[PDB]
């Protein structure tokens, strides 16, 4: 645990809630005013979220999922599924978004377990994760620490505060606006070995007093569902072609890279990625949906899905008609307020409109 | 199964404005016979209330407008791409061992 020091009592919001008293005992208080229900103050989009997504779509040399062993395959369909699952696991285990899935799931499950078991004490929770490097080694890695505060979580929306301290090699000075909520300390020097030689680099510690709700932790533990949202879609995009060709096209799609889908935009135009790139991109999208989940994301996703259907009808020469398009746009735009993920999705949708009607 | 007493008053009050009693409304609707009331009302309604269809052409959809406040800040529970990890060769295994003793 962690002695309840002044610094932890402040960072974890100890005794910050007002005392709950009967209304008749405080009706005469001068500034007794209803809670503040002001509209979230809107913010702007920044390139850092796009860089975060770009990295989440990257390939890592270390495997991140070690799945249990299912019953031995007997049916020929089971063998085909096993081969396809081998391809999917090879493509996904090395995805950075899979690392995000694992670290988030571990953090959320540890936080919830500590929250339930130790509801009065500040608990130290290391940020651990497990990978298998491409040489078979099974390195156990530490990302930092989480000091969970008091966790008398009554409602599913009740908040437990925790101080998160993460190591990093990125100087916040470069992009201060991204780290408005962090107090970053320079705590070490890391002698990184590179191709030319060795370079000495500072090592910082991003510290912030974050918070999480019981429902948020519960959905964090189930971040592995993202793996399905992506992989199922990929399978749905493979099976269709395999039905058309009357053959199993998993090998052709993964090894031969015959089929590519428009997956990104560069200055040269639209870039086409293979099935693996598309799988990683969808996995990253689902992972970020889980990480940056919020009512803004849900509302924008629904309304933009409706607009996507309209644009698809336009693309299919179904001469779509609208009764109030400006109303639909206003409904969509009302869901873009603060969350960087939703703003990035809105910019993505704008780009897709630009490249879809040209 | 009778309606009497308080339910009778509630039934009397729960009727279209012109009617005054449940039995009167029942008699009216029992003798009701369609005579083009819908068409007459459609004629009466102002022409402004219509479902005008505006075609959705390739030049119809404007780009979405994003808020112009201060740049959005990181809100994830942990660093995503900037996170640095201190690891060890120790193979051990996932879920095995004491995370503190590993840390």
């Amino acid at each position: 645990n962690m002695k309840k020091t002044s610094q932890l009592k402040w960072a974890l919001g100890e005794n910050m809630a007002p005392e709950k008293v009967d209304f008749e005992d405080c009706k005469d208080v001068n500034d007794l005013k209803q809670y503040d229900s002001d509209e979230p103050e809107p913010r702007s989009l920044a390139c850092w979220i796009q860089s975060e997504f770009n990295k989440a779509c990257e390939l890592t040399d270390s495997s991140w999922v070690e799945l249990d062993e299912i019953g031995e395959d007997v049916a020929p369909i089971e063998h085909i599924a096993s081969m396809r699952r081998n391809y999917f696991t090879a493509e996904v285990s090395h995805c950075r978004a899979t690392e995000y899935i694992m670290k988030g799931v571990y953090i959320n499950t540890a936080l919830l377990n500590a929250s339930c078991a130790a509801m009065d004490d500040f608990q130290l929770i290391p940020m651990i994760s497990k990978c298998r490097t491409k040489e078979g080694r099974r390195k156990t890695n530490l990302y930092g620490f989480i000091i969970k505060g008091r966790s008398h979580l009554r409602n599913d929306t009740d908040v437990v505060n925790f101080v998160s301290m993460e190591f990093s090699l990125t100087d916040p000075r470069l992009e201060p606006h991204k780290w408005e909520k962090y107090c970053v300390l320079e705590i070490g020097d890391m002698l990184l070995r590179t191709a030319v030689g060795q370079v000495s680099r500072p090592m910082f510690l991003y510290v912030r007093t974050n918070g999480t709700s019981k429902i948020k932790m519960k959905w964090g533990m189930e971040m592995r569902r993202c793996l399905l949202q992506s992989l199922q879609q990929i399978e749905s995009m493979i099976e269709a072609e395999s039905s058309v060709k009357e053959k199993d096209l998993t090998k052709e799609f993964f090894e031969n890279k015959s089929e590519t889908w428009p997956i990104g935009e560069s200055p040269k135009g639209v870039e086409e990625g293979s099935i693996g790139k598309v799988c990683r991109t969808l996995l990253a999208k689902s992972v970020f949906n889980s990480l940056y989940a919020s009512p803004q994301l849900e509302g924008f996703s629904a309304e933009s899905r409706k607009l996507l259907l309209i644009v698809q009808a336009l693309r299919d020469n179904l001469e779509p008609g609208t009764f109030d398009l400006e109303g639909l746009y206003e409904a969509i735009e009302e869901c873009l307020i603060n969350d960087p993920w939703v703003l990035l999705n809105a910019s993505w949708f704008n780009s897709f409109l630009t490249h879809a009607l040209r | 199964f009778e309606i009497t007493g308080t339910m009778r008053r509630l039934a009397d009050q729960s009727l279209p404005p012109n009617f005054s009693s449940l039995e009167n409304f029942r008699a009216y609707v029992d003798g009701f016979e369609p005579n083009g009331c819908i068409e007459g009302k459609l004629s009466q309604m102002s022409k402004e209330v219509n479902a005008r269809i505006e075609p959705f052409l390739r030049t119809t959809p404007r780009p979405l407008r994003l808020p112009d406040g201060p740049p959005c800040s990181q809100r994830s529970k942990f660093l995503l791409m900037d996170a640095l990890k201190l690891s060890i060769e120790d193979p051990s295994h996932e879920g095995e061992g004491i995370p503190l003793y590993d840390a």
Binding site: L59, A90, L192, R193, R201, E255 | L84
Partner: peptide
């Protein structure tokens, strides 16, 4: 199958 695509995060120190 080895995936391919056409270390400040996890360096060697």
């Amino acid at each position: 199958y080895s995936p391919t695509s056409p270390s400040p995060t996890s360096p060697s120190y």
